[PDB]
């Protein structure tokens, strides 16, 4: 193999096989030193190590591996494919990064809030290798990037227009107002016309390099799509407002420039692992010995006083929340340092260990106190060996219990010392599957009719339905028949015995011939099921991601937070879901913005997955252009300074002085709103800001709009609060939006509107202010409710006062009925229906809201209200009096409310499966505490799984009746508890 030394010297080496030939660094070093006195001189001045580069596709690649030459099989395969026997490898000096690179890295660190280059809490190079490996998708997305559409990021959907919106088009025409300087002209256009056609019509109705931008917002109506397919156009149609656009010059694509990538490409880590024949290094499948681990001891500087006098260690081998084997140590007195030095031998073979298996070490007292996880197979298909001293996590099913990260608090957490068996040669797990040539003896005989019926019934069941041993055996024995039905994939793969190598090989053969799945229609619930905690195998995840790859940008935006949370379920840092999220955030600007904020919140608040999300955020930030970087920097600056001011105020006219200090110093002239990238906030209306009379003391801030083209002088309401976790609020609001879309596809407009919520840091966040909205508790306290006495006419009189005319009042009543029904159904399904008046808001137009979901979500998870009087949802006598005449018999408005809520309940029951998987993900990810069964099953009990539509309708009517039974009792109890 030809080598180029750094003096363009060409030294001809030879192919030295693949057995421990990574000493080629030393071999070439010695060859250069002997063949050149200059190399001998530079040996005293050169860096510690050098690099290997070659030409894959014109771009420089790097051999980033110091273990074996079998990893370098990719460059050899490329060289043979190109038919170039003498291969060229260049050595490059390990140049330190330049000052500009260091400054860019510091800027990225400031944006992320976590130091990705720190290696003080890692025992391997998985995160660094993930950083090196995320370059190729980033460069692929940057290369295949259309500059104009990326700069302008049109927001379009391909769904048909809703019936209530399709009817709203008066005469199959849409009025658009185009503003040019001070001139305003209204043009009538058909809903099936592209914006280019509208622009051409406007120009003919008197240069051509112009576009339509929404007045007062950073949204462009461009691209080749009908005007009715724009999300802002649909938003304006739904609200009945006029569509105002301005003729603006297109934004410069040069502002989205991305600086050149500084690292060479890293290839893949699958080179080290080959087929079973190639690896029989030592093949993992050759070792038939049982797995064994030594628990050396337990160390803790300060003993907790929670529980003592007895302690032991439990070692579990699990693959996707299924414990393959379980071993325990002899209990010992609970003191500062406990010593065992005992080998725990499991009944599972070493060859049968599946990739993604987790060694779960837990400390029990006498109940579970500390836990820590260790991935048995590392990212490079190698079994873990040697000493490991892991700092454990302290508990205060959960996604936090699956993390392979170590506790960063080295000086205060409990530490466990373990030992794993060592070997002379590294043990490498062979490749997943060479080829499905034998077909694994696919079944030929047709299933008996009764067995076919049993299999169909098993497939038709809900995701939460447990599978018996007979059910699993039937699913596996007829796997090739179950492939024809994509709905059976989660159940088919739940019946796989992952603790046997041969069964895993059969499963890999089975999924190597997936065609019915490939052409199958994209089902969101099924794919999210395949990404849950119950699937730790990489190939099932890849299948789910490749199905997700056919989504559109709006569809991804609907489920972006859920996928970000599901990244936690990935056993390894460099997963297909991470690549998919990075690619879709680099493709679209809105997706990138929301992904940045969602990921930064998790970095700030979740220590278990800080490093992985930090690496993903680094990849995205390097991918995006400099305009996005500047906007992110401005947003982070304003967020940090508002956080500091919130801290100072919470420590205690002072707010006015501090806001004046901010406005004249370091406050950016304009910043993008984190929960609405299309809106830019400018100066701060200090004379309107205040501090609300709440226990958390949030900041009521109002910013002026930074766009001069805005049609209104209305400010931008922003609430900054500290001491509450807004992540649960974001999850609840996202699920509300998903249910709103589900109702939309069934011609149901429940008037349920979620507000803007973004968590910006540790227990801080930003809340959108809904204008002209007040709280039901305040409405009561205006007349009666300060002392606890309650009246029914207060809400009706308040709505009557805010309505100038009778038609406005009737519209307000209709909106109140629809919003109340929608929120009742949504909160009953989600289990957050038992709230107090202080967390329910209402506008002057009648719309109803539920706020502060984090306050009630944790309380309901901890208590479930089984020890109190729980109501399914807030159907308060004031609501009934607003709806009907409160005659306790019926009313046309009450009948309409009952009908629409039953319709919404049946609509949600139509997508029970997706709702169930969303609820499960929400519980296991968004809950700081530990959940289990009987809590996940709440949704399948509330969604009335396995019952008729009439039975479900009767059940929901019974829930309404029991709400009507307890009129003021629950509200009075809440008042007494709070007071």
């Amino acid at each position, epitope marked *: 193999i030809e080598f180029v030394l750094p003096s363009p010297e060409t030294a001809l080496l030879h192919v030295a096989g693949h057995g421990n030939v990574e000493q080629m660094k030393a071999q070439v070093w010695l060859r250069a030193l002997e063949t050149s006195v200059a190399a001998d001189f530079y040996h005293r001045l050169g860096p510690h190590h050098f690099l290997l580069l070659y030409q894959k596709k014109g771009q420089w690649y790097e051999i980033y591996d110091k273990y074996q030459v079998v990893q370098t099989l990719d460059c050899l395969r490329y060289w043979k494919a190109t038919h170039r026997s003498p291969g060229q490898i260049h050595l490059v000096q390990r140049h330190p990064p330049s000052e500009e690179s260091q400054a860019f890295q510091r800027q990225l660190t400031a944006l992320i809030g976590y130091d990705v280059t720190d290696v003080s809490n890692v025992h391997d190079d998985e995160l660094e290798f993930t950083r090196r490996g995320l370059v190729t998708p980033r460069m692929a997305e940057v290369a295949s990037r259309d500059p104009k559409l990326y700069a302008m990021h049109p927001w379009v*959907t*391909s*769904k*048909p*227009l809703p*019936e209530y919106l*399709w009817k709203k088009i008066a005469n199959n025409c849409i009025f658009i107002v185009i503003h040019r300087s001070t001139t305003s002209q209204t043009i009538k256009v058909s809903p099936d016309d592209t914006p280019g056609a509208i622009l051409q019509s406007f120009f003919t109705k008197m240069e051509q390099d112009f576009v339509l931008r929404v007045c007062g917002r950073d949204e462009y109506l461009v691209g080749e799509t009908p005007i*009715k397919n724009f999300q802002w156009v649909r938003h304006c149609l739904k609200n009945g407002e006029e569509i105002h656009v301005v003729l603006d010059t297109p934004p410069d694509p040069a502002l989205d420039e991305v600086r050149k990538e500084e690292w060479p490409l890293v290839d893949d880590c699958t080179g080290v692992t080959g087929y079973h024949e190639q690896l029989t290094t030592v093949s993992l499948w050759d070792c038939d010995r049982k797995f064994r681990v030594k628990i050396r001891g337990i160390d803790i500087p300060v003993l907790p006083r929670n529980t003592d006098l007895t302690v032991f260690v439990e070692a579990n081998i699990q693959h996707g929340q299924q414990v393959l084997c379980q071993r325990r140590t002899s209990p010992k007195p609970f003191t500062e340092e406990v010593l065992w030095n005992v080998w725990l031998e499991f009944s599972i073979k070493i060859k049968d260990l599946p990739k993604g298996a987790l060694l779960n070490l837990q400390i029990y007292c006498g109940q579970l106190l500390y836990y820590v996880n260790l991935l048995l197979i590392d990212h490079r298909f190698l079994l873990r060996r040697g000493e490991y001293v892991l700092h454990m996590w302290q508990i205060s099913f959960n996604a936090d219990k699956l993390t392979s990260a170590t506790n960063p608090d080295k000086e205060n957490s409990m530490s466990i010392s373990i030992l794993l068996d060592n070997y002379c040669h590294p043990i490498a797990l062979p490749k997943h599957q060479p080829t499905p040539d034998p077909e694994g003896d696919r079944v030929r005989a047709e299933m008996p009719n009764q067995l*076919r019926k049993q299999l*169909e019934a098993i*497939i*038709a069941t809900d995701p939460l339905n447990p599978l018996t041993a007979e059910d699993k055996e039937l699913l596996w024995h007829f796997r090739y028949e179950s492939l*024809k*039905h994509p*709905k059976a994939y989660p159940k088919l793969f739940s019946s796989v015995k992952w603790g046997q190598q041969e069964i895993v090989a059969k499963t890999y053969q089975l999924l190597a011939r997936r*065609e*019915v799945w*490939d*052409q*199958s*229609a*994209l*089902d*969101v619930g099924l794919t999210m099921q395949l990404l849950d905690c119950n699937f730790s195998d990489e190939n099932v995840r890849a299948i789910a991601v490749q199905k997700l790859e*056919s*989504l*559109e940008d*709006d*569809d991804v935006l609907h489920y972006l937070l859920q996928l970000v949370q599901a990244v936690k379920f990935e056993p390894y840092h460099d997963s297909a879901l991470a690549r998919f999220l990075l690619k879709r955030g680099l493709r679209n600007k809105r997706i990138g913005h929301f992904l940045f904020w969602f990921l930064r919140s998790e970095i700030a608040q979740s220590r278990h997955y800080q490093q992985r999300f930090a690496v993903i955020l680094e990849a995205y930030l390097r991918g995006c252009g400099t305009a996005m970087l500047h906007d992110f920097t401005q947003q982070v600056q304003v967020i940090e300074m508002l956080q500091k001011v919130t801290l100072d105020i919470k420590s205690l006219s002072q707010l006015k002085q501090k806001l004046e200090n901010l406005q004249n110093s370091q406050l950016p002239e304009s910043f993008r709103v984190p929960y609405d990238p299309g809106l830019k906030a400018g100066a701060l209306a200090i004379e309107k800001c205040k501090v609300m009379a709440s226990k958390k003391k949030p900041l009521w801030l109002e910013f002026k709009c930074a766009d001069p083209t805005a049609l209104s002088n209305e400010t931008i309401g922003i609430i900054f609060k500290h001491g509450d976790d807004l992540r649960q609020d974001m999850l609840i609001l996202q699920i509300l939006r998903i249910m709103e*879309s*589900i109702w*939309e*596809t*069934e011609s149901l407009d429940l008037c349920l509107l979620p507000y803007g919520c973004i968590s910006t840091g540790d227990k801080i966040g930003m809340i959108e202010i809904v204008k002209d909205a007040t709280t039901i508790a305040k409405i009561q306290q205006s007349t009666v409710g300060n002392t606890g006495a309650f009246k029914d006419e207060v809400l009706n009189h308040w709505l009557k006062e805010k309505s100038p005319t009778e038609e406005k009042f009737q519209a307000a009543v209709e909106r109140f009925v629809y919003s109340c029904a929608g929120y009742c159904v949504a909160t009953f399904v989600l289990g957050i229906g038992d709230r107090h008046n202080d967390n329910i808001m209402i506008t002057e137009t009648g719309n109803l809201f539920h706020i502060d979901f984090g306050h009630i979500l944790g309380n309901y998870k901890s208590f479930l209200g089984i020890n109190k009087e729980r109501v399914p949802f807030v159907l308060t006598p004031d609501f009934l009096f607003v709806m009907g005449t409160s005659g306790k018999k019926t009313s046309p408005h009450f009948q309409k409310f009952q009908d629409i809520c039953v319709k919404a309940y*049946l*609509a949600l*029951r*139509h997508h029970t499966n997706l709702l169930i998987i969303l609820f499960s993900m929400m519980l296991m990810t968004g809950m700081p505490q530990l959940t289990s069964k009987e809590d996940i099953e709440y949704i399948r009990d509330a969604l009335t799984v396995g019952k008729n539509e009439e039975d479900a309708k009767k059940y929901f009517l019974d829930q309404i009746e029991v709400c009507r039974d307890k009129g003021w009792t629950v509200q009075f109890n809440w008042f007494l508890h709070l007071v």
Partner: nanobody
Amino acid sequence: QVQLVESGGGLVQPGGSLRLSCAASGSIFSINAMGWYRQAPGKQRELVAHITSGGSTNYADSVKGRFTISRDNAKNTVYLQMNSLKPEDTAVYYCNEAGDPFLGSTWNGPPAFGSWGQGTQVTVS
């Protein structure tokens, strides 16, 4: 293998009506949403009518108010009822397993199925 056979098409005058039927050979028909696709001459195939396993119906904008889709899980057959036919409705109509109604990717373009049947020809003239 899932097999679908479409029937009911033919020549009809403008303003007329037609009723298509299609029988599916998939025995899990009960839990699968189905939809009707049409391929205009020199045009890509597009979903026009969507029905869920429960029975909720969603239609494309062009065919809204004139097309009605129904299913019978007992006979594993899906019916599409056309009213007030217009010349642009002339296309080859197909039925298959549709997708998610609220997903925009389903309404986007060809759903990349590999089990398309023969279809039926509808001509309005």
